Design a protein around this ligand. Structure first.
Ligand SMILES: Nc1ncnc2c1ncn2[C@@H]1O[C@H](COP(=O)(O)O)[C@@H](O)[C@H]1O
Ligand SMILES: Nc1ncnc2c1ncn2[C@@H]1O[C@H](COP(=O)(O)O)[C@@H](O)[C@H]1O
Ligand SMILES: [Mg+2]
Ligand SMILES: [Mg+2]
Lengths: 222, 195
């Protein structure tokens, strides 16, 4: 079924073109990080032990020029394997089959083209506006650490062989597109994070340089 | 179709078969993988650069109830893991092929590294399967590790002497050495040859 795949991918490449200011993806990822942090914070006000796997409550963003990666890590509630499968799996299933079904369903619901274009700019899915592949590493108090991966067509999830390295929380890793290389520039990231971190009740940091030789460390953005 | 497939499956399993032959099938597969790369090395001088040995190593992990069968053969790329790993399970029911692993395993995890790709991890319970790049990086050098999460019934397959005799039984005509991680002489561990 390679033919339909060329149609599916092309349809996406075009919808993305409608978004000249894709920066919205960073706002949505920060918003999800914030919700996950509020959830574990609320739970901690009832059960102090709930923070046992990792005592801090933060969002840490880092750029990886070499691998062409953008990492967004929060120490929030995290997701179990089933959650990765149900909460992200279905949302990231925009392949030939899924895309067409939702399309004809779009005719049924009578949704407008605007309402279609709009779905590409909100929530977790907005990550694809700038990424070819998205990798999610998560650790929830009720499960072992897992890795989920998707290219917006298929998705797979397996137990992280490195074991529990997060303690608790989630890392969203974005494999950026060539045209999104901008989101690898230290100053662009700092500007956008500072822009969307104003109403989050948790410290958000960006890995940056300071200044002996030059040193790199977490710089507070809000 | 789903009707005949199920009928045959119930039937096939009705006849007796020693589940032990699952190892036979894996060793068989390791031997082939090693043949494929060994031959290639006769034409590509640097073919074995990733791992300078041609072996089959078997390790027991009672703790996690795991059984590991690692070969330094040709390996599989992401694409091959998906393509090379249905009528398959049915064949496995008879006790032949990769799927025979499920005769003693609830889950099968396959870690593989091929010269033309990065290390990937494949996992399945026979119903569904997933595959992703190994976050640990290229740890195998080249080759494949079949990780079996054994069923309660197959708990005995984690006894040194059991696996040793089992491997010793199916290694007589393999063109490559096969080892089993064992102890022996003040409580020391290392690889012990079998064939
Ligand atoms: N960083 C995260 N931590 C925990 N859950 C998340 C995170 N990001 C997304 N999710 C979950 O996946 C779903 C999809 O995200 P969204 O499309 O923004 O609603 C949400 O309802 C969350 O439950
Ligand atoms: N250890 C291995 N190394 C490389 N390829 C393997 C290995 N085990 C199985 N395969 C591949 O997957 C297929 C399934 O195994 P089988 O059912 O024995 O045919 C084989 O035809 C091989 O191409
Ligand atoms: Mg959201
Ligand atoms: Mg075979």
């Amino acid at each position: 079924f390679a033919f339909q795949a060329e149609v599916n991918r092309m349809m996406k490449l075009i919808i993305n073109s409608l978004y000249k200011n894709k920066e919205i993806f960073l706002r949505e990822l920060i918003s999800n990080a914030s919700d996950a942090l509020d959830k574990i914070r609320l739970i901690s006000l009832t059960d102090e032990n709930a923070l046992a796997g990792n005592e801090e409550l933060t969002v840490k963003i880092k750029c990886d020029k070499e691998k062409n990666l953008l990492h967004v890590t929060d120490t929030g509630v995290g997701m179990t394997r089933e959650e990765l499968v149900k909460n992200l799996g279905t949302i990231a299933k925009s392949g030939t089959s899924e895309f067409l079904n939702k399309m004809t369903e779009a005719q049924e619901d009578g949704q407008s083209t605007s309402e279609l274009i709009g779905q590409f700019g909100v929530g977790f899915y907005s990550a694809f506006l700038v990424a070819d592949k998205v990798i999610v590493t998560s650790k929830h108090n009720n499960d072992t650490q897992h890795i989920w991966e998707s290219d917006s067509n298929e998705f797979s999830v397996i137990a992280d062989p490195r074991g529990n390295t997060l303690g608790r929380g989630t890392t969203i890793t974005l494999v950026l597109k060539e045209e999104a290389s901008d989101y690898l520039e230290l100053d662009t990231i700092k500007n956008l994070v500072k822009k969307y971190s104003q109403f989050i009740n948790f410290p958000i940091y960006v890995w940056s340089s300071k200044t002996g030789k030059t040193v790199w460390d977490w710089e507070l953005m809000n």
